[PDB]
Amino acid sequence: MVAEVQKQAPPFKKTAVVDGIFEEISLEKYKGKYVVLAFVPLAFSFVCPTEIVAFSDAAKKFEDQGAQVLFASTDSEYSLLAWTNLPRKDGGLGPVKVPLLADKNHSLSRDYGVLIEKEGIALRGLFIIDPKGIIRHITINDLSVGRNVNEALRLVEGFQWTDKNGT
Amino acid sequence: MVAEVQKQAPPFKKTAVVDGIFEEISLEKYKGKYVVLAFVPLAFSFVCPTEIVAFSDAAKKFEDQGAQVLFASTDSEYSLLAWTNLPRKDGGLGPVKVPLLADKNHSLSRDYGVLIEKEGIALRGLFIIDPKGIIRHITINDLSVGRNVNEALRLVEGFQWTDKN
Amino acid sequence: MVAEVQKQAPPFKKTAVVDGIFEEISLEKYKGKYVVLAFVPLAFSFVCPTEIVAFSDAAKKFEDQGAQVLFASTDSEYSLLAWTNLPRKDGGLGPVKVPLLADKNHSLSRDYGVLIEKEGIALRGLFIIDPKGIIRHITINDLSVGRNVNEALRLVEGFQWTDKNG
């Protein structure tokens, strides 16, 4: 069960940090809406999280497009929680407006094809999954360079439009 | 031999249309340069090729950045040639500033993970490959929605910057 | 499930260009009639398509013999359509009086034993299939040399005669 465009997205149920407390998040929870699943390699890394912040700030634009953004990493929910509790002035992430999923056992990263087995971390993959659970897009960047928030919005708007016309 | 970010890109040698005549194109030919390999499902399809045109028009901007754009489809070099000879006024593609690769035996599309076996055509995948032949990016869109030329430019500039800093 | 003389022909359902528009063609559609399935790939090749034209021109002679000619290639229905829209003066095929079947996923060419896997194209095979769907003849030519239209007519006439005596 790897993830491929046109196929059903691998299901998941993962403990996540939502507004500073733990919640069990599954894909089935968002059935009917678009989901944008986006991975990041490590918490507390020496790379500024501008990428997660950009998606956090656009949370509401996604919600208006009928979509929910979810982030995911191979850190525990405790590491990710602490990451949010450590403000940005002090080198952390600060609170955020999107769930952060703790993929400690690596199943998520493996099923979505982004895990770097030797290293224990996910590549910067991003998947857009439609209301019926079909993957309609895959981006995967090496770690050095980030993703564009507007691309995800453009694509979601694109797939909605085509969902409700010919194509 | 599938394609993965951080791994060596699958090599290939495919007959392509360059400037209305055939040339054998391999990836090894572009070692030292960034390569942006982009697939498209079918020639002569009744869907406007604005996507290939946008990348054709930016061919030279990529070249200036030290990158080569390559397009690829599961059509023969003769179908792709005829596509270029048929102007856009008349429902074709017109000439183009980027090699068009004929993946008739499907090996390319299979090795890069974009082939839809049941259908015989490639998804709209796009791969950025660095000078050492390592895949640094993968985009794959379902057919209904296209790719953004500026994303490929942004990413290439991104990977160059990080290559040197 | 390969094709052999005396055995049931591999069924198929393939999108084809008939009179400049797409139609889904299966073998089951011609049950009761002889079918003459002939392969060619490639479209827009730099070789004059005299072979397809000869069979196009004899379309009606086949129809009189109780047979339907079908052509087939590993090109898409869009490439094949464009081939017909491009007239012969300009290096294309022009319209034709026989369906052109797009075997893009190669299943047809594989099941009929004509695909050159390394290359992605069909050899110049021709199959005559009787009303019950049994293969009664197989021709397969390497690419350099073509088929004779009259052979297919002669064979069909032959198999009809023997169908109704023998």
Added chain:
Amino acid sequence: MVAEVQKQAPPFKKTAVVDGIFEEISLEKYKGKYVVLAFVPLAFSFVCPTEIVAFSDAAKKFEDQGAQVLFASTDSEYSLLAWTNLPRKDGGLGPVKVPLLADKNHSLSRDYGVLIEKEGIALRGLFIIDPKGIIRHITINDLSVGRNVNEALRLVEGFQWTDKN
């Protein structure tokens, strides 16, 4: 080891009737020449052998084209010999200008894909094999209808022309 256009023809070594006596015939014997190998289901069958006669009569036209015609069946060299010794007025074949190969153990017919296992006889297959031993054509007719001598001549001439241009 089945026979396919573009591939090497299955080698063989079979006892045949040549000019009313037995000789061991192999394909390797005709290397350098075109070979037209043609099968028939049964000797003494109730079908007139006009087909074998037509190819026998054109023997020399084939020889002029640089080709050798060979016939083959699943009968013994003794059955095939007797067939030639029985003249046509009397319901046999009469003498012929082409070797008749006795495929009693069925290996030839199996390797060339014409054997009907349940029945023990070959379909009316015809193979044209070039000087390097590559199969350039395959015809296979059900038993009720025969082959055209001129098709084989046309094809051989065709493949020679294309061999040299």
Added chain:
Amino acid sequence: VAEVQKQAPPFKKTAVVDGIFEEISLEKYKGKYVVLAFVPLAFSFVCPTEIVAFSDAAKKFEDQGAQVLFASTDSEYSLLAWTNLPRKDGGLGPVKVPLLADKNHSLSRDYGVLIEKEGIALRGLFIIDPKGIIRHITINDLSVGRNVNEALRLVEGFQWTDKN
């Protein structure tokens, strides 16, 4: 394969009986002894005195409650032509025992007489009783023939023992 004491392999083969084709099976002779004898090849350069000897004794076998059947790996058409070609002219002439065309070799294979590399049957002879059990097997190399009286002696032997 066929073994003494075991059930004989069943068969259904096209044969030449009185110059026309008939489908012969073993099941047809259930209740009688069957003496199945192989020979291939037809038109071979070796005189068929052996088949003639068994043809001439056809009726002695019938009196003993037995049927003789011959078999070869030639087609029914080759075997037919063999009978139509008289002996003056190097053939066999008519015969009073069915000639079975084992073209697909199944019979010869099941009875263990086929020479696979060659496509021909050894000179095997099998005596099969009324219940279909093989009570005797002879197999000669091709160079030397069988004795008709041996088959009669053996059949008489097995009848006697069948009833005491």
Added chain:
Amino acid sequence: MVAEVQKQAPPFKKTAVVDGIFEEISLEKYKGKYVVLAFVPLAFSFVCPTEIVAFSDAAKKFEDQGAQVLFASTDSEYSLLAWTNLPRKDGGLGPVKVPLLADKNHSLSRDYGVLIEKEGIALRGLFIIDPKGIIRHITINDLSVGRNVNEALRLVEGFQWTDKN
């Protein structure tokens, strides 16, 4: 492994009773001569040995034909010895002019295809083996009915004649 007409006979080396004492008999010992190997179910059986006696009496006729007769059973050389020491008046065999081979471990009977595994005894098989060790004849009778001595003589004479040439 098994014995077939036209093939090399399975070799053997078996302890046998010859003139009231033991000797190790192999087939290799008779190379150059015809050998007629004949099996019998058991010693001391309630069946009169008239069959072995007939072949014993014709020993010398076989020798004149250039042949050696050998008999064989699945009994030990001690059982077979005792069989010969027990005269016929007293229900035994009496002495005989042909070696009697003790196939106790069943290898011979298995290799020659006559063993009845469930029972441990050989069928009444008879094999004629030529000077080069090739099997030229096989007879195998069910137990109820015996073999004919003259058939073996006729066959041996037959195969010699045809051997020469």
Added chain:
Amino acid sequence: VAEVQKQAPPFKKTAVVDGIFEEISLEKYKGKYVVLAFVPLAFSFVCPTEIVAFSDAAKKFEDQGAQVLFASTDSEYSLLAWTNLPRKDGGLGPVKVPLLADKNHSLSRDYGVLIEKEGIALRGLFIIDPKGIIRHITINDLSVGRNVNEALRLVEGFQWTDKNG
């Protein structure tokens, strides 16, 4: 195979009892101790003092509630003849214990005493209790025999232990 503490392999074998044949199985002696003893060959050049010793003690075994059975790989006809040949004349003479003909070797194989290459049983002796459980195994190479008193001692031993605790 047979093992101490495990159920003895069942059998049904034709045997010589008082000069005639009877079918002996182990199931027949359920409720009694059975002492199954093998011997390599009949008519062997060794006087069978061992079988005689067990024959003479038949009645002491019967008094202990035990039955002695002997077994060999010879036919019932060879074994019968062995008994009919008196000891003065090199045989066995009659005996007071069944003699089992293991011609197909199944018994000797199942009890682990068969010497495959040779076709004979080692001098094994098995004591089997009323429930059919093997309580002892002796197996001697051929050169040296068994002691009758050991079998009696062991049976008495196992009875005693069967009835105390």
Added chain:
Amino acid sequence: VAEVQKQAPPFKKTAVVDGIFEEISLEKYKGKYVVLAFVPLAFSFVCPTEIVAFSDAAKKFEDQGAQVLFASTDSEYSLLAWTNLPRKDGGLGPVKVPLLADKNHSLSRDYGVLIEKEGIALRGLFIIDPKGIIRHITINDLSVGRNVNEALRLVEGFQWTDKN
């Protein structure tokens, strides 16, 4: 897997030593006793008193000829941040023993402490001698901690017995 009396599974893992990264292998301590101790998660709601107790006794171990190493399935960045976050503020504060980031789980798998379903290590502790042989294994469920003096006692025990 790791077993008493057998060679310990080798490793080479990025670790936090004095606020910076160093690559730590077992081969680095050949000649000394190594006490390898796992803890399930950084920043967990459970007080690290256990790591602190072993950190405080670092020098007693060093005097005995032993090196203590800690290991978790967190990244070196999570573990670094854990040390930079003082205890007043819910972290670990600095420590006197390397903290090894077993992100790919190989270490925890090879030492038999990984809970596959969960992605975390049990509280295992292994004592490994100078030749790299495992001479002791402790493994505690999550609810209850380890005793520092046991590890010191055992190391002293194995040294004494090493020299007798």
Added chain:
Amino acid sequence: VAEVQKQAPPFKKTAVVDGIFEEISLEKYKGKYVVLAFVPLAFSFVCPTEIVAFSDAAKKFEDQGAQVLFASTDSEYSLLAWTNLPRKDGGLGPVKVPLLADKNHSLSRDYGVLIEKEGIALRGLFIIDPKGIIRHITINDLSVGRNVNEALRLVEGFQWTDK
């Protein structure tokens, strides 16, 4: 094999309890903590001070709701004789804990302490809770022993915070 957090491998083994044989299974102690400890050989030239220490603390374990069990790959007859041979005379003397004879090695194999090549158990100790879950594992090489107080501390620990 036996693992912390998993159900302990069941067993049923003949043991010496107060100089006579009894069949001991784990199921017998369901509801109580069990401390199963292995010892490699009886009559070995090393001191049983370890078994004595646990024997003397038998009652402290019983007060904590726990039963100590010892186990070795010796027969119940060797183990019995070990207890009948007093310590003055180089044996063990009586003891207040069952001694389990794992002659067929199944126990030692299932608990992961058997040294196959040798036929003896390492000095493993397992604490098993009332539901039969393993909550602790110690395994020492043969040269060095276990601490009685550790087992008491751990059991008290797991009772307090139950599960």
Added chain:
Amino acid sequence: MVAEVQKQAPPFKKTAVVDGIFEEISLEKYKGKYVVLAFVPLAFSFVCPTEIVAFSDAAKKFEDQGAQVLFASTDSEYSLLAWTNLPRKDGGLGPVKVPLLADKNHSLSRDYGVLIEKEGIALRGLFIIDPKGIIRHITINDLSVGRNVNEALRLVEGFQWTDKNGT
């Protein structure tokens, strides 16, 4: 690798008690002599060792015949040692004139076909092995009943005699 009459005996190398101290005994050590290998289920069992004592007392008669008697059990060399140190008055074995082999890992008992897997003990098997290492006899008694010393002497004398004649 099971033991059978006429076949090579399985080799072994086992720690044994010889005269109250440990020694490594292998079969290879007695090549050239007959060996009489005899098993016993358990030390300190409630059954009197009369059988081992009878063979111990005849040790020297065996030695004079050119044979060595060896005993073997699945107990450790320490259990077997203690067994000898415990005199017979006090329910033990007392010293003995034949090596006692500790088959703790069960390899010996398994290779000679006497191990009762479920139980961990050897049946009362006895094997006579000739100077070339060939098994010339096998006795195996269930546990309830013992073996006869004179049988082993009779058999060894038997096999020697026949070794050195035609008959």
